[model samples]
Target: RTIKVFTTVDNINLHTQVVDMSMTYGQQFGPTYLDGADVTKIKPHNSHEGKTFYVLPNDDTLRVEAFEYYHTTDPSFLGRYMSALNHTKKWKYPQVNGLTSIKWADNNSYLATALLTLQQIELKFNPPALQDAYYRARAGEAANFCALILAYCNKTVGELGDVRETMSYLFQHANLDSCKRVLNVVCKTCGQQQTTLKGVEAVMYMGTLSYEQFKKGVQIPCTCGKQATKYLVQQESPFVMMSAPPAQYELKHGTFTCASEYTGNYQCGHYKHITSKETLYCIDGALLTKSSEYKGPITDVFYKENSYTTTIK
Candidate 1:
């Protein structure tokens, strides 16, 4: 009859199976000793101190075999060994410093090849439109788009195109029903007309203002030295003028006499003519001017001379 016994030796718990009661009882007097050499025969590098082997009763041969199987056939040990082997054999791409070149293969299956290559580089389509395009490609719908993605993957890492924007462009014009929308914008100030994409991409890249806000009478700087809104003309209408309107500000350089007069501390009462040698700029209705030198008189009200005395023995 076999019985299970638990023991903690050198902080290691050993749940050993007692095969014979007489052998286990004999172990109390003087335990059967097996050194590191005996244990190493079962699993290499396993160093153990000599102690009474409480597992198998009489046969050392059966005891050694059982110990070998116990260590060698463990699922965790096998998994670790296999993992080490894979780490050594596989070419793992470095995750630090910079982008790594993708190893892309064209097997005539564009979508699968693109996805697999992207997975190899640990990249995924983050945008919903791009993801939808990928799913559409998987269903044999967007073959050209898939080919484009595969071609993009084949390029050098440094020369890779913007994946999100490219996929979005393809998705937006994938069918005739969803063609590229163009806007016929005419500057209300100068009557300058041009065709532009009916998208917020330009507005987003330039300023924090939205395209919808710009269309609803938010002022933009025109080339004709005026702040104005653009009117959307009809499609196929020829541009009346070709002058491109400035997207930002038109700085003015001038001098303004300080008209503020207050008798309080830190008040601008000098009435100095603030000459702006550099360009004058405005932000949110506040005008800023830069000068090369200070022109205002220095006041002695805030400045006081200090004296200190030191005593020496």
Candidate 2:
């Protein structure tokens, strides 16, 4: 089957990234084992969130997302795939050294990861024709692919997580002796130290902080400068913001900076509700988007060109 992905002129860019990634995968493995190719890339700008969608094998437009998935049996793996996609920060454009390099690119890593996820899903539901040689040939490689991706995914996630925060925070890179102690407070492992390094992968993969927060948080600590407050996640887009309601607004206590001071403005474009003494406003001046929580409206501008990969996907 062909994977058709589209992109929007708006800040979002994963659709284009997917199409390009699929094409690369097709080239990388297209002529290989799956010699009988099952994948292909369609035109761009055809797939997007705002556009209306139709149920596959049918022309009727879908009014509900759940209905679309329910009928197609397509697991909306976009979030997970996208989660891995945003880990990259190279915005140089045009000549990205490793944009499509599946071995090191974030999106490349995620595509392989999602493929493995798909393989497992197929086995759980579709099963193999004979569960023997045929099945092994089909599923085995994909699983191995996923395993490799997971390892790098973990490696990339950990190494990058720490590295991203390093430039400025390098001094605080949590040396071996202190890492064990920091883990005790910042995080913890089994009865013993679980390894602070191990914990970063989970946060990078999941959401212990915003991609912005992830990037900047490290910067703040590393710079030797200090902010009583900090933006904790990627918030330029309202997606992640929605995930967290203005909690600080409800109760702005502590070091006692500025409470939810009313600045006026009900026009409805977008506004930041400041809360607490440690409230972060780094992303506030920029345009606030309502799309995915991980992406800010302006973030797309930075990610737009062909700068190659982030470590997430």
Candidate 3:
């Protein structure tokens, strides 16, 4: 018998397969294969080395031909195998979930942009899952909750893309407070938080963060041979600060990169505020005595921690 495999096309179970296997954290407990009748059922605690099983396409849709398994060491073979099997030399499309009209696009550029927009629309309609997560995000919580939901469900990107469409959507729609929140919520789940460039870069998608917060959590040591922190600070544009040069003392999006600054708080100029009420920590992390110092010299500013009345220069 010329052995073959088929994938169910129905919208239920996302059609995916394990073309080859080793110990995977997701299936770390064990692997399984079908019965003598050849029906898909889990027979746990059995060794699945070189064992063949149906990696359902959608847990329902069936192709006329059996896609014989080809052994692969490729980490993503489970996601990419069906496309190769179909003889198209590229993967095709299917509905991601009944919630949205997600389909695999032909290539790179169109992947997440299209999917993200659709998810945003679905989110806008206020499903309980999306809405609850959205509300929590605005309250400065679960900054990466939406993205994790997909991963937790074993959604695949295969070679299709490192699609962060839902992540991008959540950030734009949901409120993220700090790089800290970004690190805690998203990066932690990916097992690579705050300390690495990958972690910081992902955090940036949610919102801008100051250099102090960025440096404080760096997991990956910089390749540059410096014992100090490095950053690519994008200051507030010249036009915005032209009328008041002192405001130029401030730094905006101090994006992290591979360079260094050995002294002083590089985050000195960013403004911050506490949510307990209307109190605002002014530019220097100090407060003007009156909180409004429009007058000359602004002489009455005080160091916030000590109220030492540090006169503004």
Best by TM-score: 1
Best by lDDT: 1
lDDT of each: 0.28, 0.23, 0.26
What's the lDDT for residue 13 in model 3? Answer: 26
| Clash pairs detected, candidate 1 | none
TM-scores for all candidates? 0.23, 0.16, 0.19
Q: Give the alpha carbon lDDT tens digit for every residue of 1-313 in model 2.
A: 2444432211122123233333443342221111111222322233332332111121123213323322222333222222322342221111111111112332232232122222222122111111221233243323222222223334333232221222112112212121111111111121222123321231222222233433332222212333222223221211111112222223223322111111223221232222222332212221111211121221010111111122331
lDDT of 2: 0.23
Q: Candidates ranked by TM-score, best first?
A: 1, 3, 2
Model 2, position 211, has a per-residue lDDT of 37
Residue 193, candidate 1: alpha-carbon lDDT? 54
Candidates sorted by lDDT, best first: 1, 3, 2
Measured by TM-score, how close is model 1 to the native structure?
Answer: 0.23
